[PDB]
Amino acid sequence: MKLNISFPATGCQKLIEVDDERKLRTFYEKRMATEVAADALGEEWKGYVV
Amino acid sequence: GISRDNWHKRRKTGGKRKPYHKKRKYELGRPAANTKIGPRRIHTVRVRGGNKKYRALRLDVGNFSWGSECCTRKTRIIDVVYNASNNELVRTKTLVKNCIVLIDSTPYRQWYESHYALPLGRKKGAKLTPEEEEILNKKRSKKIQKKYDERKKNAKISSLLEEQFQQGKLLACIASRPGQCGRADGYVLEGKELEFYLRKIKARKG
Amino acid sequence: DIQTERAYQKQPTIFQNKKRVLLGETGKEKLPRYYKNIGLGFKTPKEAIEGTYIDKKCPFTGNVSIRGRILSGVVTKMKMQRTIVIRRDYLHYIRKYNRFEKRHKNMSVHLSPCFRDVQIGDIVTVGECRPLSKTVRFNVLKVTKAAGTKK
Amino acid sequence: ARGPKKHLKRVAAPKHWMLDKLTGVFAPRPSTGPHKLRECLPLIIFLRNKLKYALTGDEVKKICMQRFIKIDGKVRADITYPAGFMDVISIDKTGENFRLIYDTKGRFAVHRITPEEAKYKLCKVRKIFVGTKGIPHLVTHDARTIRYPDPLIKMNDTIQIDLETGKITDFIKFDTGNLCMVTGGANLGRIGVITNRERHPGSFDVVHVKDANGNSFATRLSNIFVIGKGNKPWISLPRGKGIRLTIAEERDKRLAAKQSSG
RNA sequence: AAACUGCGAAUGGCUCAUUAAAUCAGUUAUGGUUCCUUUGGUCGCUCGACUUGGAUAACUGUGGUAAUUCU
RNA sequence: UGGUGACUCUAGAUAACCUCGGGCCGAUCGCACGCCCGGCGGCGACGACCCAUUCGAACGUCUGCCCUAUCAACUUUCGAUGGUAGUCGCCGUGCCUACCAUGGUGACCACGGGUGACGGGGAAUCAGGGUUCGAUUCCGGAGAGGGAGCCUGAGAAACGGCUACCACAUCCAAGGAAGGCAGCAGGCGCGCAAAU
RNA sequence: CGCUACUACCGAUUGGAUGGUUUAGUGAGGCCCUCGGAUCGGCCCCGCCGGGGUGCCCUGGCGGAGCGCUGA
């Protein structure tokens, strides 16, 4: 289960690999065009909504 | 896939004909409009030649005619009472060509006091309260009063039309196809039309 | 005698509810009659002028035109209403056997109530029209009586 | 066929296009225009067979869009433009003009004309129409809609139009005693005088036309082009003046020309 | 070049399975209707801004499926 | 006003309508140069309501198709015949609805069946008459395995467009994906029988 | 009547098969109508300024839309 992250304020894209099932529990059971607090990806991803 | 061919059916002698070519595109048919009443909805469909035909599904008002002195005003559709084709098509509120409906009597009445200056409607026991028409009666000259007097020297109509005018609804007929142009035009019923269709309604409702 | 069915029958050229000065007598209650000359040297009869029948497929008082072919035939049966069947007897030639054969091709034409003095065997002429029915294409222009019937 | 045809076979061409057989499969189908398909003549056919200015189908295209050929005062860049009866064609640089008149046989003929005669064109009115705000209209046989005509122009007359302004200069009335010629049918190109005009209600009204030497023939009403008022023609007639020589006199004339030529 | 837009692909080519007043042939009519393109006319006839708005291509960058003129 | 053999034809007048899926009345592009006190000009390209024309298409009128009686009656509230009024269709019309009358074809062969039947212009033989063939280069019609439905477009029930059924069939990590040579060459089958 | 071969015919097996019409029932897909509203835009308040005009409007945003209107 991969993740593609784009930053629209400068148009920079990269992909990260998430092999841990506990990090994607917040992502599951959601629709499109909704804001999810990505507070589980890591220490530098505190206070991010995607 | 509704076809309009003349080769699905038997011949003049009664013998069956065998079809040789399938359904073409000029040979086309479409489902019925079933023009109801309510807030106005009109759809467009592209036809042969690139033209458009307005499919009136629901409508409110109509542009009827009253031919005794040739006036036409926009008039609201009230209720359908008779259809010469199908007896089910009065139970469902459907509009077709040469159909029999009731329309409201207000703008023809306003035209009647504003042109002929005689009261129409306004049944006894309640007179003209909001004081607008006698304002128009006053501040005239002698020539204009002579012109109105020579005009209303002959101001007689049918008594059944008068009774419909106290009743507030005029029995009307539709002379337009709503599934082709999208509007509901026509003319009000007068003369022998009124007695014939009133006889038909009183025979059917009895 | 008229107004038999569930809708009013009228001629959509004239206005039948003109407002007179009086709406009484002496000038009213004689409705105008719509008629036209069909052409091709044919003369309209008086029954289409002073009659009271209402049609939409009559060549004289109606909305149908006359163009194309002019044919003739003998009236065979008068069973179905407002239209009749005529019989055309013609001769066919064979090149191999230099001898003729007679053939008949009966077909249905339209009879307006203007011509009601029609019995079996009367010679009529017809003119081509637009299709008025599934098998009806022709309108009768005049009627000619057969032999006898001196009464 | 689900749509309009766009090709035309060589043996399906009309005979007056005057082609051969063992050259190609197809024939030039003209673009849609004022004239019908079976009554017109493509510009490629004329430039490649009659005037012999070009030999292939590309040379005709080069001459055509080189802006060298003018059609009724207007330059045309279509190689398959329909040219019909009295279509005035002009070449501005070598100073030649041609008028298309049917000759004594059933075909077109090359006919060089002076430029002073190339300024106008005789054409036949087809029907009379009334416009929107009460404007009378004329429909001409080459589809020229002319506003505000003369009040004495009837259904089967002939008007003369200057090619620079599009207006009517003079006209010929349809009457017996006028010079006439036929456009279509078994008779074609014969010049004669109208004598009789039989009226049949509901069908074609045949007429009777007498030649200038004693021959007579009958054609339909649509097969009529009035070209003169009396005996003098209003345009320059081609060689032979349209007399329709029979096969015996044609054989005698050819034998006399062969004997005189040697 | 690419790509957006517009036009053409309903033409041409091959075959004779169906179809016996059906197809087709000659002769008529659309006064009972639509018509791409070309041609000609109309395009200040109506009585009430010295040029407006935001979306997508092509492009850049980043990906999935074994696989497509896929996205 | 004008016309037809003939209009409920065109034009004229009055009173209105003018659809939110909405009629038009130019927010487009290039070349050559400019006169007259910022205004003002020449030739084109594109687009547009309407009208006629051109290419046509489509529905109808009259006449004409091979054999068979071991097919003599057929159709008929599962429209067959006609009338009234409507729906739909670009238009007429049982094309289809609701109501009426029992009509319509037939020994002059209807109906039913068969066809080794696409139709015609034509081909072979032929004193005069005829007989047989016409799948085949030009014209018209029908189909793209066979029925059914449809988007776009002026014009398609289009198949070198799409969508499901069955017959048949390709690739595969087995989850899925992709097609119809009665086009030109070519191959198999079928065959007495037909090419790069 | 005796022998060989062949042709069709009748016939148990209510044999096998290929096409069509059809009672009744099911019926994918498209089309039309009634609903359905995931998602995407625009205007009026809070917060900062630079104002000509003589503490107030033209100028730029996000968090709550106030789930207010309206369009696809």
UniProtKB/Swiss-Prot annotation, chain A:
Positions of modified residues (ADP-ribosyl glutamic acid): 35
Origin: domain of life: Eukaryota
PTM per Swiss-Prot/TrEMBL: Ribosomal protein S6 is the major substrate of protein kinases in eukaryote ribosomes. The phosphorylation is stimulated by growth factors, tumor promoting agents, and mitogens. It is dephosphorylated at growth arrest.
Cross-link Glycyl lysine isopeptide (Lys-Gly) (interchain with G-Cter in SUMO2) per UniProt, renumbered positions: 14
Subcellular location: Cytoplasm; Nucleus, Nucleolus
Leader sequence segment: none
Similarity field: Belongs to the eukaryotic ribosomal protein eS6 family.
Subunit text: Component of the small ribosomal subunit. Part of the small subunit (SSU) processome, composed of more than 70 proteins and the RNA chaperone small nucleolar RNA (snoRNA) U3.
The protein's role, per its UniProt record: Component of the 40S small ribosomal subunit. Plays an important role in controlling cell growth and proliferation through the selective translation of particular classes of mRNA. Part of the small subunit (SSU) processome, first precursor of the small eukaryotic ribosomal subunit.
Protein name: Small ribosomal subunit protein eS6
Species of the source: Oryctolagus cuniculus
Curated annotation (Swiss-Prot), chain B:
Modified residue annotations for Phosphoserine: 159
One of the record's GO cellular component terms: cytosolic ribosome
Keywords: Acetylation, Cytoplasm, Isopeptide bond, Lipoprotein, Membrane, Myristate, Nucleus, Phosphoprotein, Ribonucleoprotein, Ribosomal protein, Ubl conjugation
Composition skew (Basic residues), residue ranges: 7-25
PROSITE patterns the record matches: RIBOSOMAL_S8E
One Pfam family from the record: Ribosomal_S8e
Superkingdom of the organism of origin: Eukaryota
Segments traversing the membrane: none
Membrane topology: Lipid-anchor
Region called Disordered, residue ranges: 1-26
Modification Phosphothreonine, positions: 129
BP GO terms, sorted: translation
MF-aspect GO terms: structural constituent of ribosome
Function comment: Component of the small ribosomal subunit. The ribosome is a large ribonucleoprotein complex responsible for the synthesis of proteins in the cell. Part of the small subunit (SSU) processome, first precursor of the small eukaryotic ribosomal subunit. During the assembly of the SSU processome in the nucleolus, many ribosome biogenesis factors, an RNA chaperone and ribosomal proteins associate with the nascent pre-rRNA and work in concert to generate RNA folding, modifications, rearrangements and cleavage as well as targeted degradation of pre-ribosomal RNA by the RNA exosome.
Name of this chain's protein: Small ribosomal subunit protein eS8
Gene symbol of the encoding locus: RPS8
UniProtKB/Swiss-Prot annotation, chain C:
Lipid-substituted positions (S-palmitoyl cysteine): 58
Modified residues (Phosphoserine): 65, 108
CDD domains, per the entry: Ribosomal_uS17
InterPro entries for this protein: NA-bd_OB-fold (IPR012340), Ribosomal_uS17 (IPR000266), Ribosomal_uS17_arc/euk (IPR028333), Ribosomal_uS17_CS (IPR019979), Ribosomal_uS17_N (IPR032440)
Highest taxon, organism lineage: Eukaryota
Post-translational events: Citrullinated by PADI4.
Entry keyword annotation includes Nucleotide-binding: no
Signal peptide (from-to): none
Keyword terms, alphabetized: Acetylation, Citrullination, Cytoplasm, Lipoprotein, Methylation, Nucleus, Palmitate, Phosphoprotein, Ribonucleoprotein, Ribosomal protein, RNA-binding, rRNA-binding
Compartments where found: Cytoplasm; Nucleus, Nucleolus
GO cellular component terms attached to this protein's record: cytosolic ribosome; cytosolic small ribosomal subunit; nucleolus
One BP annotation, GO: translation
One Gene Ontology term of the molecular function aspect: rRNA binding
Pfam families referenced in this protein's UniProt entry, alphabetically: Ribosomal_S17, Ribosomal_S17_N
Oligomeric and partner information: Component of the small ribosomal subunit. Part of the small subunit (SSU) processome, composed of more than 70 proteins and the RNA chaperone small nucleolar RNA (snoRNA) U3.
Assigned protein family: Belongs to the universal ribosomal protein uS17 family.
Name this protein carries in UniProt: Small ribosomal subunit protein uS17
Organism in which the protein naturally occurs: Oryctolagus cuniculus
Gene: RPS11
Swiss-Prot record, chain D:
GO biological process entries: translation
Cellular compartment(s): Cytoplasm; Nucleus, Nucleolus
Chief place of localization: cytoplasm
Nucleotide-binding as UniProt keyword: no
Domain of life: Eukaryota
A GO MF label: rRNA binding
Crosslink feature (Glycyl lysine isopeptide (Lys-Gly) (interchain with G-Cter in SUMO2)) location: 229
S4 RNA-binding domain residues: 41-103
Residue numbers of N6-acetyllysine PTMs: 232
Alphabetical UniProt keywords: Acetylation, Cytoplasm, Isopeptide bond, Nucleus, Ribonucleoprotein, Ribosomal protein, RNA-binding, rRNA-binding, Ubl conjugation
SMART domains from the UniProt entry: S4 (SM00363)
Keyword presence, RNA-binding: yes
Annotated GO CC locations: cytosolic ribosome; cytosolic small ribosomal subunit; nucleolus
InterPro entries: KOW, Rib_uL2_dom2, Ribosomal_eS4, Ribosomal_eS4_C, Ribosomal_eS4_central_region, Ribosomal_eS4_central_sf, Ribosomal_eS4_KOW, Ribosomal_eS4_N
One Pfam family named in its UniProt record: Ribosomal_S4e
UniProt cross-references to HAMAP family, sorted A to Z: Ribosomal_eS4
Subunit structure comment from the entry: Component of the small ribosomal subunit. Part of the small subunit (SSU) processome, composed of more than 70 proteins and the RNA chaperone small nucleolar RNA (snoRNA) U3. Identified in a IGF2BP1-dependent mRNP granule complex containing untranslated mRNAs.
Family: Belongs to the eukaryotic ribosomal protein eS4 family.
Official protein name in the record: Small ribosomal subunit protein eS4
Organism: Oryctolagus cuniculus
Gene this chain is encoded by: RPS4X
